[PDB]
Amino acid sequence: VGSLNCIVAVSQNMGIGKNGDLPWPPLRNEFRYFQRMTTTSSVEGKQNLVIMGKKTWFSIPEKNRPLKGRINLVLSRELKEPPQGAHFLSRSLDDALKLTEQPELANKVDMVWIVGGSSVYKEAMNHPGHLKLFVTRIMQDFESDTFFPEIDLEKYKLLPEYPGVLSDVQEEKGIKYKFEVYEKND
Ligand SMILES: NC(=O)C1=CN([C@@H]2O[C@H](COP(=O)(O)OP(=O)(O)OC[C@H]3O[C@@H](n4cnc5c(N)ncnc54)[C@H](OP(=O)(O)O)[C@@H]3O)[C@@H](O)[C@H]2O)C=CC1
Ligand SMILES: [C]C1=NC([N])=NC([N])=C1[C][C+]123[B@]45[B@@]67[B@@]89[C@@]1%10B81%11B698B746B814B562B%10%1143
């Protein structure tokens, strides 16, 4: 795999989770952005792959698992098969990336999206080569118990804009946020 993508929504105090859910009330269009970015592939015959940790999998409501229109892969060091409804299980990110090149997934996977949580992001962000980080900055503090790893600015550059990503401050349910895209190359 020549490139990876991470996608996250983070509060101003770097929070991503609280009590097995998001720290902030649900933001419908922010969720639709996540859906659009992770689902969309114009390569006929392929789908995108989402990679997530075990707690993130179980944080998705049952009726919405697996995430529709995407191949769902869960990371765990302890499970011996995928959680019910998930398509694949790997012991690490590198194992997961190697899996996509074996006969079953060889001709089936377009983009790879890392969707959290903290340890999944941390590993992905140090993976060699080209990686983009799609980061929604929720412009408020929220009490959180799970946090997004620091963005190494020696490695990552904030892109001034990105095709298909809105540049202006957004607002839903009185909460302001903005969409950012970062990239590293080495
Ligand atoms: N705001 C946002 O964009 C997002 C928020 N969330 C929130 O974050 C919380 C869940 O995330 P978090 O608590 O960090 O937990 P994770 O989803 O990262 O799950 C942790 C478990 O996943 C497995 N795991 C995680 N990383 C790896 C790794 N790199 N290699 C192998 N296995 C791995 C382990 O399972 P095992 O113990 O079985 O080995 C580990 O105990 C929830 O509150 C959720 O709502 C989650 C994603 C994004
Ligand atoms: C809200 C949001 N927004 C975003 N820009 N990236 C993300 N990774 C998430 C977190 C998610 B996405 B959608 B819902 C919550 B559950 B499911 B999937 B799971 B992961 B977790």
Swiss-Prot record:
Residues 3-184 form the DHFR domain. InterPro entries: DHFR, DHFR-like_dom_sf, DHFR_CS, DHFR_dom. Changing residue 31 to R: Reduces catalytic rate 5-fold. Reduces affinity for dihydrofolate 9-fold. SUPFAM superfamilies: Dihydrofolate reductase-like. GO terms for biological process: axon regeneration; dihydrofolate metabolic process; folic acid metabolic process; negative regulation of translation; one-carbon metabolic process; regulation of removal of superoxide radicals; response to methotrexate; tetrahydrobiopterin biosynthetic process. One of its GO terms (cellular component) is cytosol. The keyword Disulfide bond does not apply. Pathway: Cofactor biosynthesis; tetrahydrofolate biosynthesis; 5,6,7,8-tetrahydrofolate from 7,8-dihydrofolate: step 1/1. Substrate binds at residues 30-35, 64, 70. GO terms for molecular function: dihydrofolate reductase activity; folic acid binding; mRNA binding; mRNA regulatory element binding translation repressor activity; NADP binding; NADPH binding; sequence-specific mRNA binding. The keyword Secreted does not apply. Changing residue 64 to S: Increases affinity for dihydrofolate about 15-fold. No effect on affinity for NADPH. It is found in: Mitochondrion; Cytoplasm. Keywords: Cytoplasm, Disease variant, Methotrexate resistance, Mitochondrion, NADP, One-carbon metabolism, Oxidoreductase, RNA-binding. Changing residue 35 to K: Increases affinity for dihydrofolate about 3-fold. Reduces affinity for NADPH about 3-fold. Widely expressed in fetal and adult tissues, including throughout the fetal and adult brains and whole blood. Expression is higher in the adult brain than in the fetal brain. NADP(+) binds at residues 9, 15-21, 54-56, 76-78, 116-123. Transmembrane segments: none annotated. Changing residue 35 to S: Increases affinity for dihydrofolate about 2-fold. No effect on affinity for NADPH. Pfam families: DHFR_1. Belongs to the dihydrofolate reductase family. It is linked to Megaloblastic anemia due to dihydrofolate reductase deficiency: An inborn error of metabolism, characterized by megaloblastic anemia and/or pancytopenia, severe cerebral folate deficiency, and cerebral tetrahydrobiopterin deficiency. Clinical features include variable neurologic symptoms, ranging from severe developmental delay and generalized seizures in infancy, to childhood absence epilepsy with learning difficulties, to lack of symptoms. Key enzyme in folate metabolism. Contributes to the de novo mitochondrial thymidylate biosynthesis pathway. Catalyzes an essential reaction for de novo glycine and purine synthesis, and for DNA precursor synthesis. Binds its own mRNA and that of DHFR2. This is Dihydrofolate reductase. It comes from Homo sapiens (Human). The gene is DHFR.
